[PDB]
Amino acid sequence: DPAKAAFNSLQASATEYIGYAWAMVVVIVGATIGIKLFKKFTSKAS
Amino acid sequence: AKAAFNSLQASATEYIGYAWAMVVVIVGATIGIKLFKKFTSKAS
Amino acid sequence: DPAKAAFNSLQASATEYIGYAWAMVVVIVGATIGIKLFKKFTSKAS
Amino acid sequence: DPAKAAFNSLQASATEYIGYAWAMVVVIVGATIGIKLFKKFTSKAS
Amino acid sequence: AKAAFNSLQASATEYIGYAWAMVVVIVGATIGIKLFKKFTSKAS
Amino acid sequence: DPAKAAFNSLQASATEYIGYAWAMVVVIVGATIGIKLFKKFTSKAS
Amino acid sequence: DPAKAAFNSLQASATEYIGYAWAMVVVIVGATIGIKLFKKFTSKAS
Amino acid sequence: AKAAFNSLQASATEYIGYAWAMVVVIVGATIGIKLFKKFTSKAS
Amino acid sequence: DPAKAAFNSLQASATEYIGYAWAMVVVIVGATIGIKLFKKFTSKAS
Amino acid sequence: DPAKAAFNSLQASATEYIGYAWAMVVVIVGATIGIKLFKKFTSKAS
Amino acid sequence: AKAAFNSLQASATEYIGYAWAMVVVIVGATIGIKLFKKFTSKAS
Amino acid sequence: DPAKAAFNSLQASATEYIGYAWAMVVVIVGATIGIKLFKKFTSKAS
Amino acid sequence: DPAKAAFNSLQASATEYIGYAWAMVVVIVGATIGIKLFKKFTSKAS
Amino acid sequence: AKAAFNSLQASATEYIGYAWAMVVVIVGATIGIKLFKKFTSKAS
Amino acid sequence: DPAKAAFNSLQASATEYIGYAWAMVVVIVGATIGIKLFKKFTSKAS
Amino acid sequence: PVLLGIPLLLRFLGFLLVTLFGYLLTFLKKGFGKIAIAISLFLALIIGLNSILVGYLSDISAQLPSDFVQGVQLILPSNALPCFYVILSVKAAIFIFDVKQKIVSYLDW
Amino acid sequence: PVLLGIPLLLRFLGFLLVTLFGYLLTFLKKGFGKIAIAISLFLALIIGLNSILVGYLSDISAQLPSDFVQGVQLILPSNALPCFYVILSVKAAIFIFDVKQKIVSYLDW
Amino acid sequence: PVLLGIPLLLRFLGFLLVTLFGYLLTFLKKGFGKIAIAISLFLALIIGLNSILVGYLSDISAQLPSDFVQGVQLILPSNALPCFYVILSVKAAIFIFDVKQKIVSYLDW
Amino acid sequence: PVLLGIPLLLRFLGFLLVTLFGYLLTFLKKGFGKIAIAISLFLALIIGLNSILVGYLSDISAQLPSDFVQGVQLILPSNALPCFYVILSVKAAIFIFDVKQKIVSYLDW
Amino acid sequence: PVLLGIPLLLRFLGFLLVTLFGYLLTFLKKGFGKIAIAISLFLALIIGLNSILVGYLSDISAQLPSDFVQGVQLILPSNALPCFYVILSVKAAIFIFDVKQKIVSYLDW
Amino acid sequence: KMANANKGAMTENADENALQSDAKGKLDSVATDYGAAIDGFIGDVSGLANGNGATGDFAGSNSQMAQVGDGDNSPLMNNFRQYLPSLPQSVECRPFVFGAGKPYEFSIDCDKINLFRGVFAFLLYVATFMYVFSTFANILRNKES
Amino acid sequence: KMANANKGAMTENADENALQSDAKGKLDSVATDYGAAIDGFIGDVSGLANGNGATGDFAGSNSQMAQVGDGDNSPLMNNFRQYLPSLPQSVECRPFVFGAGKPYEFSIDCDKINLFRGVFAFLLYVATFMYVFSTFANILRNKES
Amino acid sequence: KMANANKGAMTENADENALQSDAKGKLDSVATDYGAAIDGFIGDVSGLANGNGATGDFAGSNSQMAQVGDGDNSPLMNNFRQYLPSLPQSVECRPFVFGAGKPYEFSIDCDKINLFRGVFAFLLYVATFMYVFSTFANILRNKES
Amino acid sequence: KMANANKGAMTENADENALQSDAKGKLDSVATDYGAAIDGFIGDVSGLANGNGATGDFAGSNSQMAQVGDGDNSPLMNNFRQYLPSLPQSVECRPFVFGAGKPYEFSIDCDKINLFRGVFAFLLYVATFMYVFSTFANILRNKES
Amino acid sequence: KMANANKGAMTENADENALQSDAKGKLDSVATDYGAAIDGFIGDVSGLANGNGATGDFAGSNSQMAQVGDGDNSPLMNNFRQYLPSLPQSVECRPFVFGAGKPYEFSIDCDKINLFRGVFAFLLYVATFMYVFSTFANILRNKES
């Protein structure tokens, strides 16, 4: 039954997409948190 | 006739099982990203 | 039913996120308190 | 009439979905309120 | 002919009754969640 | 008509939410006032 | 012509929907304004 | 033939008149709610 | 044309909303000024 | 060719719609700017 | 046959010319309103 | 091509908006500075 | 094969659209950053 | 018959290759604009 | 696979944006600190 | 039973003492007059400063517009004006207390 | 073995010295009475000012409503009221220290 | 009717008293000169400090740019500059009042 | 070669001067004792105030919880505690400087 | 033409007056020495306090990092450092003015 | 007895109780004026201080001290009351009505306004009480109160 | 010997040890009163200062100095305690429940409230300690403390 | 009568009313100079204080006291007026026009600007009045005013 | 020569150099005690001021002045150090890890934390330096420092 | 004439103009030292105050007063200048370039930065001028300036 193999292939593709998206969002959120914390700490310091 | 309907019903349920097994992963990833962004924003 | 299993998995993921967020917010709150205390000293002195 | 039973089954499924969603949203909103109140109280304290 | 139309009209209204009985629950749940989030945010 | 019954139910739910929100906001306002009063004393002293 | 009567009936239904929506939104906005004014006045007072 | 086209054109314009008379009310209500919320928020 | 009549009606409704909003904002501004004046007196005294 | 005349008529209708929308948005933005400036000036004054 | 295709292609391009001449005005108005609101908000 | 002409027209409109916004923000900034200077004098006096 | 040439033409059109959009967004973001920095610097100065 | 199916499959994959080569550019431009706006706003 | 190449290109673009944003935020933070230091001197003097 | 000149010498000594002590009394009265003059000058300076300060407030006078009255009355509690008047009364009491304490301290001159 | 009038002259000189020194003693006692009067006036002024200040606080008295109690009790730590009372005690101690130091400084009059 | 030497002794006593009291007068004038010198030094120090302070303000002078004038004129009420000038006049009045009070207090030297 | 009674009169005058100047010496020593008593009272008052103030701080003592330590250590630069200790040392130095200056000013009594 | 002993008595009176006035001169010089000692002690205390305060600033010294220089130079007007230096100069001028005024006030001892 | 004749020739009868009495009488008659002057100065300054009044050199300051006032009523301070800014008198709460007569008519219920008015009154008291307490605690300190 | 007769006629026997003793006795009997008055004034002022007490002219200020108080208990200051505003007494934390009994029932876990209460107590101490330290450091300076 | 001869030999006629008059005349002629010096010092210091003027040793401070000034016009203070920063003069309100001549032309109606200008004037008065009132109330206190 | 006999009868040989010497000797022997007392008081007060020490009446204040301390080490001030609040000691920066071991694991790079720590140290210096400078500039002014 | 013989026997020729001259000469020769000492003290203190200098007992304070300084150059204050924090020197405006060389390259036009720099300079002046004006107005008040 080709449908089962097709579904498995789409699931694997979705999983690899999820992995790439997780990597990118981790990078973006890390940069955003770093910038926000720097701005907050400097604002409170002076 | 009846056997064809039974086979179609079975195949339909098999595909539903696969569609659910896919959508759970997709929805879990989406909700995970959403909650991650929301909570990292709220905590900082 | 797959739906209830997915909902429980989502709830567990949310709980883990909540715990990590609590830890990080405690750290950041401590940093903010330290900044205000060590600036208030000098500021009130003058 | 199968339609009436089908409608009842979909209604029951919707009700259980609503229950799960209520549980999850209660958890999320409770955590958000706790974090927000902690941040507000600490900010006002210092 | 006429009896078929009458039966179709009755069945249609029966289904409308069920569709309304479903949508009231769904909309009530959605609006409840929305108002809950809005008011818990506003109060804090 | 089901529509008016649904609208009245929604209005009643909103009223309950409003009452609970009023109680919680009163509590949080009391907490904020307490924090400011007991920090203002020491701050104005010095 | 049944179409004219049908259009009139839909217009009347829309009007009653508008009335119910107006009542609910008035209640919601009144509560929101009350809470917001209470919070603002208390914040300015202390 | 031509009379049928004329009747269809007239009926079409009659329905357009009714559709406009409905949409004006619906859009007026929607815009009223939107502006009410916006201005009550801005004033407070 | 119905379109221009609808647009004029919307403009008139907006004008009424603007007038009411101006009145309410004047009242709320007066309240805010009163709160600040009667807290500033005591605060500056000490 | 009726299509060209129809396109011209729709363009003219769109132009008059744009004119009405411009009038309404000018009124709304003027009121919003006035209210915002009044609130800002009063807040800075006291 | 070929003449019909040529006429259809020409008429199609004529309509595209009119569709573009309409959409430029519509999009210009929309973007103008958006930028007006954004900049009047930013300046105040 | 109509696309590039439309884009250039949009850019010119944006430039005009930017110029007007700069003028208005300069005026409002001057007003804010005046308010703070003439309140700071009396406030610092006391 | 006309499809390949058509795809190339659409790609070129998309590229020129991207160029125009980049120019416009650069202008808009530059103006926004300038206005925001002016307002922030003036607010901090007084 | 079989040759027609093979040709259709090949042509389909050729078009998929072109569709991907287009969508990568479009999505890259969109995400670039989004990230540019987000980061220029966050930095200031 | 084209998908992974596109994701890596997006990640590289994000990294470049992050670097430029870090530089610009450092400059703006320095400006804010300078403004506060040179206003605090005169303000505390009086 | 004493030689001549002793009573005259004693009378001269008494006269000298009386004259010197009278001079001392006159100088004491001069000092008291100086203290009175100083007190008068101090109080006169205070009164003149008050007169100048009261005059400036006439020009810059302004009143709250008819608007903003509704909101102030909406929020104003029953003990706002009493608190303001208590603050003013405390200011006046402290002022007169300082003046009286300075008058008391003038006892050391 | 001396001429007449010398012992009488010496007695007169002693009498003059005794009278003058007695006058000095009387003036010293007058000065001490002046110092006592000044101290009494200063303390009386302080007491009167206290009496006036205590009276004003009766009118403007107000209490926290029944609400807002729950939140304050929710947040209030165990050492808030002790800190407030310590501040008040420090205020009182400094006040009496200043009064006693002024009394000590009255030794220079 | 007295022995020789009594009038000479009385004249000598008077001469001694006159000389001593003249010395006292000279010392009193010296003290008054000291007080005048002190007052002159105090006023001269004030004038010199004023001269130094006025000089610093020339270098750092700056003016409001041509812009921001429109907004300030848009908002400025009729009694802003009068209030600023009243504050400056109050500052000057208090300064001269303090100077005159110090001059008055120089009466205790 | 002088009449009787002149040496006795001169001895009496010298004795009177010696007695009066001895009385003056005794009064001077009394004044010095008064100054010493005043200084002792002033220092004792300072010490008592210090004792009371040190005692209050025992009750209200509190410590930073185990949490918030990580963030403070995350941000704390190398010269925060040195700055705090420098401020405290400056406070102590100014206090003892004021005390010593008051002791110096006691030279005018 | 006077009896014996009168010139000797007058010489004795003059000698007594000279001795007493010389004692007064010696005591006056002692008082001036006391005033000089007080001034020296006051100035020495100021110098010692300055020495201690200057020493503390060496440890806690820190510098602005290489970054943040670009922004500060981007915003800094031409009269920021002149204003800061004017403030410091005003501080120094007021300090020396206070010191000189205290030295002037030492004329009342 | 030539001795008796010479003694009688150079002797005058002087009584100690007469010369001493005369000298003491004059010295007392002037020292009483001295003490009266001292006591008069003391009484004048004390009367100026406590409001009893002064006579003599200090009589001219009676008007000035009466103008200063006693208790808390200072006629010198009451001059500022004429220029005191006018402020609204607190009245009962009246709800504010938005869009009266329209379908969007909502009004502030003024139930929470009274609660806010109570907490505002409490805060105003705690501020005034602390101000008065610190005012009295810092009377000898040369600080504004 | 006429010389002897004339010498006896104009001579009275006077003893230095009698006149000197009498003059010194009178001068001492009055100088002791002088010194007693000085010492009495010194003792009265010292007793008023340190709370021992005063007798004589300063006896009237004993009541006033007792009313001022010593240590930290000032009866003049305790008058303000009667009007001291009432404040709630700190108790254990009670969680707040929103929508009790409803499907949307959530409560503040009060676990973080205790952590906030600890850090608030620490901040209140550091403020009070700094206030007391600066109060003692600025006693001779004429500043509020 | 040898007694008479011896009495006449050692006697000089001295009159009390002459020696007393001479001594009192000299003492008064110098005490008048003493009193004149005291009164001159008093008058000089009083004239310096109240602006009447001084003569003698204090004549040199007349220029300095005239430079200080009286009333509120201090020539020492007027030196700062030359360097006073220039500020705009308040004029009537002019509406601001955005995008003049364009379809998006809106202007600030300046009707609410006048209301804001009124409330701003009121706030500026209440601040200046409070400042002046506290300035006069804290003149004897060594505080900035 | 009866004149010689009468002169011898009423004459006693008195030497100026003896009476003057005796009177001056007594007066000097008591004036030296006067000067010694004055110098002793001066030395005692100076020694109390500069820490050398005092003897006599002021010897009792030696303990009190030693308790006050000199330089910057005040034993009266060191009593507060025992109750000084405990604060963390600054250490090197440690990055904070969020969601350790999970796919969403990100950590603060702590590269910018060091830059912030540098600018914070600079700001803390500029504040402390300004505080110390103003403290020394306002020592004679009765202000907190 | 026995009267003449007795008068000559008990009489010594004394001249008023000699005894008076001698006494006045001694008294003047010591009063000149008194006045010289007073004038020397006055001159020493005045010279210390105005920077002329002192001689004698006050000569030791010349070094201390020279160390204090005059005008505005205080060598005691210049010690703090060595530890003065280093601050950047103001230069011309340089635009900041974001993403140089990239399609998203935008730069701050620095035209408005100059306007902000002008208004900032104006605000810094108005603050410094007000500070200096209040500093001079509150010199006699014991307040920081």
Numbering used by the authors:
A (entry chain C), C (entry chain G), D (entry chain H), F (entry chain L), G (entry chain M), I (entry chain V), ...: 5 to 50
B (entry chain D), E (entry chain I), H (entry chain N), K (entry chain X), N (entry chain S): 7 to 50
P (entry chain Y), Q (entry chain O), R (entry chain Z), S (entry chain J), T (entry chain E): 2 to 110
U (entry chain K), V (entry chain F), W (entry chain T), X (entry chain A), Y (entry chain R): 262 to 406
Published text:
Our reconstruction of the bottom cap reveals a pencil-tip-like structure, where five pIIIs and five pVIs form a sharp cap enwrapping the pVIII cylinder. Both pIII and pVI have a hook-like structure with two long helices (helixLN and helixLC), located at the N- and C-termini of the structures, respectively. In addition to these two long helices, pIII has a short helix at the N-terminus, and two short helices (middle short helices) and a long loop situated in between the two long helices, while pVI has only a short helix in between the two long helices. The N-terminal short helices of pIIIs assemble into a helix barrel, maintained by hydrophobic interactions and hydrogen bonds. The helixLNs of pIIIs and pVIs tighten at the bottom of the cap and alternately distribute with intervals, forming a sharp-tip like helix barrel. In this structure, the helixLNs from pIIIs are located at the outer positions while the helixLNs of pVIs occupy the inner positions. In the sharp-tip like helix barrel, the outer surface of pVI is predominantly hydrophobic but contains two positively charged rings that are formed by R12, K30, and K31 in the helixLN. However, the helixLN of pIII is rich in negatively charged residues, which are in close proximity to the positively charged regions of pVI and shield the hydrophobic surface of pVI. The middle part of the pIII long loop forms a β-hairpin structure, rich in aromatic residues, which inserts into a pocket formed by residues of three pVIII helices from layers 21, 22, and 23. However, in comparison to the interactions with pVIII at the same location, the interactions with pIII are more extensive, indicating that pIII may be able to effectively compete with pVIII for binding the pocket.
